[PDB]
Symmetry: D2
């Protein structure tokens, strides 16, 4: 009935806050949907790492687009997709926006880091990020959600970050991704300043400490992101199975840690396929 | 050495060769890290990951894409599940050629009917020979065609051996003996078909779990663990999702997560920081 | 702010008849758009032949889907896409419909030939109904399913009309009447299967060439030109190759080439220099 | 038997010169093969324009890779692929090289223009192009051919261009693409200087005038490229058909300009498929 963008907007409005969980593939998206999340996330780092590449902007529009298409094919849950810095200049960004819309994506986030390579965290000038934003806004539909992400806190401090975010909003950004604020009591100031919904990145093993969804909502945050949480647990679990099989010559020890065949069928809605398989035959 | 040759060598040198399923490039790296000599792309995995049932709904491209991603990331010989060959003789030929181009080492193709009274229905022996011929006619020498027979459950051991033998005569390099229920069937079966035999040690099936050693002792050359890792990943993911949902934070899941440090190790990340300083 | 399906439906209603021209790629689609066509077509034979494969249903959903995506990315002109027999069973068909919708396609045509095999074999009417139901069950309202029948050559006009009518009852939006040999068959056929009918005006076929006007007069709503441009392109390409080979330079081919200026026009290149200064 | 790179190298050695013709798709490649060309070319501008995009480095590795795969799937004729500036930094370039190799490509050309610029044409510093080249060379196999392309003539003049090209060769470039030399008598100096095979770009409607293959070979050129010749003729022919159908309500007038159904079957080697259609 509603467009993906509209669904996302509605989820951000109704939830306090909206928890957005990362899913690396369609099946994970279904698991998340099953647990009752209202929005899901495609991590740029996830897309890269899953290919066995580092999160260094090596991936392009197609790497991400393919992963996004697979997910949106399997669920109507609004998906937020990480488009890094926009994969190139103004034309690439425009293409990215159009392609993500076509792929039934709800929202993207684009950040103000530098792209290019022939000192780690370097940002573009505010003006350049505005250029990026304008390129995106000029071709985007109304419903579709552009989240501008700023990486400025660690480098430039709270005031400079708020300044950027505000300029980004004026440039047409729908929502703001505030990367790695260190003090919970910075959020109320930040949220009040930028007016639009704010996303907080609750990734593990970062510089940021872990706050609860409730805590962050209390400090004015509208969205909480869990970008790699599931992926990290999956990787450990997979490694464990591999090690078990290798060391023991059989997977007996891994059996309690595996999802049952029954649960798999449930998630796939498998019985609905056997119903139509007999109704025609 | 070519991918096919590497697979052949792994089958010769290991007793037996354990082949573990990996759904994506990263899993393949984890498997490589643990020291496995061959990896596997599960057809059911390809489908289920897309959120589809394992009913031959996927086509050459669904599988090919997943295969390309893996072979891009590791030289470990990959066995790829091509179901029934995705169509007629021309489709099969295309599948073989594309998998070769994608640096795949081996495929397995089975003798079930395509998309079919519920059960397992098999094609006539002759039809499977046709499928095999289509594949063999375009395959290079090194590349490995494993013919898979699903006949045990339906037709019993003797009929299954008959098929497998015909498949070998039709040009099949190796045999995938699906769901033999008794360990003591293997020695008869392996001796009969002469070529290397793969046993499918999937969990939660009709088959019970035997060890690699046990199966090697009964004449088996390859043991397949098609979905083992995937199943554990799915449970772990669900747990994280449930934790975050119930508690509003992932604190409780933290002990169950791979460290950022281990991630960098697997990605060989330090090799990238080397070029990041050499240029600047 | 109309959906692709709605745009196609509107084009079929307003044109007498709607000419639908085949384009093998996005650029051809733009050329067609430029000339002023109201709908475009992605030929299954085109998709295959361009890959260097014969039109024998070797291609799958992805081969076609990729080519379709490229086109719809470049124009809003409603695109009709050939999905052969649906690429497999009921689940594959459902997937095909959903994926084509997602790819911003306006309409598909699916036919009643067998997948497996000097002649055409058809599926039983019931099997084609099954195919149609699979498609209809997941399709949106606006999206257009054209059922194609290959029955004329094999079974004759009456049997073909019977099938087409059953197909319409099964949920088909429109009918593709493949290879009717006589213009005077159409009025009977169109009146019988009350939905819009497409006529396939391919060259070098069994069918003779009638005009759009002639076919409209005989009750036809859509005329398809599936490979017309492609065939001319192939000859032109071969000619250039031969020129370069024989003469060591392409001087002789120059009058037969599109100017760089025209290329920029079609690509709307000036609109890119506009954004290059606006930022 | 021989690798794509080796085949290309052999074609460059044996032909005087090697004409390399652009083909936008697999079918065009077959037509070119049919006419008897020894090498074919995938134009970056072609890849973009066919999608309806301008040749402004908007396309990425995947846009080009897909088009390349389609072609190499259909013919073993060595394909030269335009990879623009390498689609990004050193890691992207490495990926591009590896992926093109995997896609059975014979050769790529990478140029010394900037990727993103200002707000006629800007080049990177020599050092940056060396960096690009090193990234490519470090992961490329021996057989595979890297052609370094310099766009420096128009901007910086012949001597500066020769200097660059020579540095590029020292950095590991196999061959040199000398874009838009305006005077035939520049080539002998240029070719002698940069001792490796040189490609001349005989595109129409450029700044360059049209010389013959023979003429260019006489001036020391090893390869002549015809990047968009076929494409341009195709576009005009297509437009004509569209206009005919639109204006006349039938395609009668276009019929003499169309390839016969018979010729199509010949090119597709269709009789080989009817052979298997009766063997089954
Ligand atoms: Cl990383
Ligand atoms: Cl699905
Ligand atoms: Cl504001
Ligand atoms: Cl399943
Ligand atoms: Cl990689
Ligand atoms: Cl034997
Ligand atoms: Cl054909
Ligand atoms: Cl476009
Ligand atoms: Cl009716
Ligand atoms: Cl252009
Ligand atoms: Cl082919
Ligand atoms: Cl030198
Ligand atoms: Mg990211
Ligand atoms: Mg399978
Ligand atoms: Mg067709
Ligand atoms: Mg180019």
């Amino acid at each position: 009935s509603m467009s993906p963008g509209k669904l996302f907007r509605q989820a951000v409005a109704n939830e306090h806050p909206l928890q957005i969980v990362g899913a690396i593939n369609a099946y994970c998206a279904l698991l998340a949907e099953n647990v009752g999340f209202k929005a899901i996330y495609l991590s740029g780092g996830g897309v890269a790492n899953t290919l066995g590449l580092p999160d260094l902007g090596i991936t392009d529009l197609h790497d991400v687009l393919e992963d996004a298409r697979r997910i949106t094919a399997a669920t109507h849950l609004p998906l937020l997709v990480d488009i890094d810095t926009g994969f190139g200049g103004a034309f690439t960004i425009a293409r990215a926006i159009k392609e993500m819309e076509r792929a039934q994506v709800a929202a993207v986030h684009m950040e103000d880091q530098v792209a290019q390579k022939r000192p780690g965290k370097e940002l573009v000038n505010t003006n350049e990020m505005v250029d990026r934003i304008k390129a995106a806004v000029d071709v985007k539909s109304n419903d579709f959600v552009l989240i501008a992400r700023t990486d400025a806190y660690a480098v430039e401090g709270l005031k400079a970050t708020i300044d950027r975010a505000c300029t980004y909003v004026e440039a047409g950004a729908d929502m703001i991704f505030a990367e790695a604020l260190e003090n919970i009591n910075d959020y109320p100031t930040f949220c009040k300043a930028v007016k639009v919904p704010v996303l907080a990145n609750m990734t593990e093993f970062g510089k940021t400490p872990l706050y609860t969804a409730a805590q962050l909502a209390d400090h004015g945050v509208k969205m909480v992101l869990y970008p790699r949480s599931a992926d990290r647990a999956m990787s450990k679990a997979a490694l464990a199975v591999y090690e078990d099989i290798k060391k023991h010559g059989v997977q007996t020890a891994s059996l309690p840690f595996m999802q049952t065949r029954e649960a798999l069928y449930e998630v796939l809605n498998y019985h609905a396929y056997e119903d139509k398989l007999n109704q025609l035959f």
